[model samples]
Target: FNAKYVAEATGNFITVMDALKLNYNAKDQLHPLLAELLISINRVTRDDFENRSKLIDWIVRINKLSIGDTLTETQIRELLFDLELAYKSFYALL
Candidate 1:
């Protein structure tokens, strides 16, 4: 959590999600099993193609590994899974 990348990643995530009007709370309606999977989206973005591309680019930009980081592979792997689900859902928005 002390890694600078978290700040960068979180900022990037929040900005993108907000602009796309995606909620991080739908796990609100959904019984969310993993915290990371809960991006609270209740609707899908119409700019599906462009948005998805930037998000993929952002993910690649944000893979953080550094000394003394507390986040583990299990946590990170699940986070990635959550993001994957989010993108799919976003793409599915009609």
Candidate 2:
């Protein structure tokens, strides 16, 4: 498959799985699989919506499933900064 097609498929898969996991584990129910799914979704969303910060933000929120557990604030900020830079670079090329 093409790179873009594969990337999109991966993003959709992660989003679907993450939503299901989140719904399944709520109200003090800890699910590492759900947390991992959210993280995957966050990464894939960043790739899927390269020029859309809103989608990235939404995925980032989902990635916060562990509440103070997952990535640190600094790490997230850095990741976002990198993503933004990459988006700009790609847009410039296009």
Candidate 3:
């Protein structure tokens, strides 16, 4: 609920983003990692936090995409960047 957890949450976002960026071999694992990120972010966020909804929205945006769904590199970058923004914007507020 504090700034530290918020930082950790963002770090988690970066981890996922990096994995995607690096073209991590196991594509199937992305969903689980993302789902875990969603839960972790949900747990860390406070109702009063500024970017909570946006963060959840971005995570869900990616979470909804299944393995069969086609996603471009540009799309992935855009989504993760938005998610990164949502997390960092709250950091600035803190």
Candidate 4:
């Protein structure tokens, strides 16, 4: 996948995960959904071009929509950490 596809997929996954977490009443069901989200993240990490700019752009857009300009540095760090974890996991899988 190219940078655009990676960004789009990542953004969509984040949106779906957020919705699932918020709307789903069952934690048990949410756990599996989270796992699948992680898997999709892994796939993106493996197939994407590993562009930090693309991921950053995705995060910026999501943050703008989800919480306006209020996302903290800690939140951004967590997002970056997740992306890095996905990258490492993909490398290990390969």
Candidate 5:
């Protein structure tokens, strides 16, 4: 739950995305993710370790991903690579 750890140069999904930003969104299919992360973070108590868990809870409200969930790392990876919000990517264009 270390905020510093997440902001560090490694071991963080968001950090990895930033370092490989161009690579992750090379086609720019998910630009809103980063923007949403920013506003979501700006309102959070990131300085407190316990508060970190709140973000995990937030994701579970929308999707099945969560630490307490039974799915394993491999399964999460499978979803990550195929990660796409059908509505987010196409509705506005439509």
Candidate 6:
């Protein structure tokens, strides 16, 4: 993906992930959005294996939280942290 596309996608992912921190009980709705976000991440990081590896690790962590329906405060907090780290890694592509 181009820099502008990657940046917009990353912003959407981070924005949505951060929004979940306060009230994240809509995993049913979020699953689709999360899938899109992950897809974006995959495409953006395809050539950048370093960030890909890091984001996959965080994806694993986020998946663990996703196993349950609604997220606890701590769960969403960790999710926010993961996306923040992923956001930092995405900047490498930009």
Which residues of candidate 4, in runs, are more than 4 Å off?
2-8, 18-22, 46-94
Each model's TM-score? 0.30, 0.31, 0.61, 0.32, 0.24, 0.65
lDDT of 1 by residue, 1-70 (tens): 2345334434444444442233232222112222222232211122443244444443343334233333
Q: Give Cα distance to truth, residue 62, candidate 4, Å.
A: 24
Query: lDDT winner among the candidates?
Result: 3
Ranking by TM-score: 6, 3, 4, 2, 1, 5
Instruction: Give the Cα lDDT of each candidate.
Output: 0.38, 0.44, 0.63, 0.48, 0.35, 0.63
| lDDT of predicted model 2 | 0.44
Supply the global lDDT for candidate 4: 0.48
- Candidate 3: tens digits of C-alpha lDDT, residues 17-83: 7886776423365666666666767667544454556555654665566776655777666666766
Clashing pairs in 2: none
Per residue, candidate 5 scores C-alpha lDDT tens digits across 3-93 of 5532431223354244333443221322334335434443432333322344344344325434333434453343343222311221122
Cα displacement (angstroms), candidate 4, residue 55, comes to 16
TM-score, cand. 4 vs. native: 0.32
Work out how many backbone clashes candidate 1 has. 7
lDDT of 3 at 10: 77
RMSD (Cα, Å) of model 5: 13.1
lDDT per residue (tens digit) for residues 1-94 in model 6? 5786687677777666766754664555455556677687766656663345644554454456554566667766666676676667667666
Provide the lDDT at 37 for model 1. Answer: 22
| Models, CA RMSD each | 14.3, 9.7, 3.5, 11.5, 13.1, 3.5
Q: Mind giving the per-residue lDDT tens digits that candidate 2 earns over 1-94?
A: 2456446545544443444434433312324433443454454444444434543453545455665355444544554454455345433432
How many clashes (backbone N, Cα, C below 3 Å) per candidate? 7, 0, 0, 0, 0, 0
lDDT of 5 at 24: 39
> Which residues of candidate 6, in runs, are more than 4 Å off?
48-68
All candidates in order of lDDT, best leading: 3, 6, 4, 2, 1, 5
Q: What is the lDDT of residue 44 in candidate 4?
A: 57
Tell me which of candidates 5 and 6 scores higher on TM-score: 6
